[PDB]
Design an enzyme around this catalytic site. Sequence first.
Site, PDB file in Angstrom:
ATOM      1  N   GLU A  78       0.813  -1.217   0.000  1.00  0.00           N
ATOM      2  CA  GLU A  78       0.000   0.000   0.000  1.00  0.00           C
ATOM      3  C   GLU A  78       0.840   1.259   0.000  1.00  0.00           C
ATOM      4  OE1 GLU A  78      -2.683   2.202  -0.730  1.00  0.00           O
ATOM      5  OE2 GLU A  78      -3.810   0.448   0.406  1.00  0.00           O
ATOM      6  N   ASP A  82       0.940   4.069  -2.986  1.00  0.00           N
ATOM      7  CA  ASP A  82       0.697   5.469  -2.721  1.00  0.00           C
ATOM      8  C   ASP A  82       1.848   6.336  -3.195  1.00  0.00           C
ATOM      9  OD1 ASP A  82      -1.001   4.997   0.524  1.00  0.00           O
ATOM     10  OD2 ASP A  82      -1.592   4.520  -1.528  1.00  0.00           O
ATOM     11  N   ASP A 168     -13.172  -0.069  -0.853  1.00  0.00           N
ATOM     12  CA  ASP A 168     -12.965  -1.108  -1.867  1.00  0.00           C
ATOM     13  C   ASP A 168     -14.021  -2.184  -1.842  1.00  0.00           C
ATOM     14  OD1 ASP A 168      -9.290  -1.390  -2.102  1.00  0.00           O
ATOM     15  OD2 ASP A 168     -10.615   0.272  -2.626  1.00  0.00           O
ATOM     16  N   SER A 285      -7.475   2.779  -3.147  1.00  0.00           N
ATOM     17  CA  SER A 285      -6.123   3.044  -2.672  1.00  0.00           C
ATOM     18  C   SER A 285      -5.169   3.530  -3.760  1.00  0.00           C
ATOM     19  CB  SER A 285      -5.550   1.708  -2.175  1.00  0.00           C
ATOM     20  OG  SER A 285      -6.084   1.330  -0.930  1.00  0.00           O
TER      21      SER A 285
END
EC number: 3.4.21.100
Length: 370
Positions: A78, A82, A168, A285
Amino acid sequence: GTAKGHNPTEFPTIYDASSAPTAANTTVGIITIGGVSQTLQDLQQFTSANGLASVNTQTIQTGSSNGDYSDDQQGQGEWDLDSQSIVGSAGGAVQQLLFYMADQSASGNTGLTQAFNQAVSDNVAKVINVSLGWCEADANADGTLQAEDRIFATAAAQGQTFSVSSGDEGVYECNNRGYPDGSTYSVSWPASSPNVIAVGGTTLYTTSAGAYSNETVWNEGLDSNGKLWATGGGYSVYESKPSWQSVVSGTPGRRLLPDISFDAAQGTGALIYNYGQLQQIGGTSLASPIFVGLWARLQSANSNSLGFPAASFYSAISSTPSLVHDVKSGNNGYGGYGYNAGTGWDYPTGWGSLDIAKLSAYIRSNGFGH
Ligand SMILES: [Ca+2]
Ligand SMILES: [Cl-]
């Protein structure tokens, strides 16, 4: 148009940002849970492979000095998504990338709360990504929601933009995080805060030449465990509607989300280095860091003088549909349930995705934020 993965450095041409300044003059934050040691190696792989100048980074322990800031292994993917998506969407440069690391051994839900608080107290990052979320009713039940909204309220007032993934699990955020629950719809915190920009998800189609072709709702159905993978969207059951959302008629007196949306389908997702290996990854995300990089470059173009932009998005886009790619096709539920995209603002995707060239021209003429 076709469905394929994309290098993060492609997002500026997809969303018509490549003629705009980069984010070289804007500092960007990322909220993480735990450490980012592998993520920083992956970031180096990313900039080096793409021939980009290296990114100036800092890591900040936001909790106790005795806290647990070890790497969360899955978490690295993650923070990779990002950081690489931000830097690519930003045009390959940010002033600095700050990782606000939550203590993993903090009491209750206070780890993340302290991370938000440090980003706001420091007031160094103009734009901060939050690719984290959970059922807003669960956040509300133990007082997390109230505590964190105070922090985001301070952020918005002082001109910082928190960008938060809408979720999500489509409309099924509070059903064990994504199992289909028929007509029972819910939303994610902190996306449901009126003091953040909530970013939903699309399926992105591009031409063979790489041009933008079209976007539909992100909804990739159920995984093997039976969990839905789709863009979060709906309305808060707690938060009142901010004044600027009055332009979306026929909706409840609640904070409607998301505000805007970008690429989220795994099938059309980002190619991300994770523990050294290139992987194709989606989610809201992904959509939120795309927005963060684009917004950071608009801040750089405007001497970091744009305030919290929610009210400006709603007035500008409602009056100026050319500023967005309006998503019209798809739904964010399962089995005939969920919300449907349509003309203008909708619950799966909000206003849709930004055309950054047209938005930049609008801002040069009119300014933006408050
Ligand atoms: Ca729409
Ligand atoms: Cl207001």
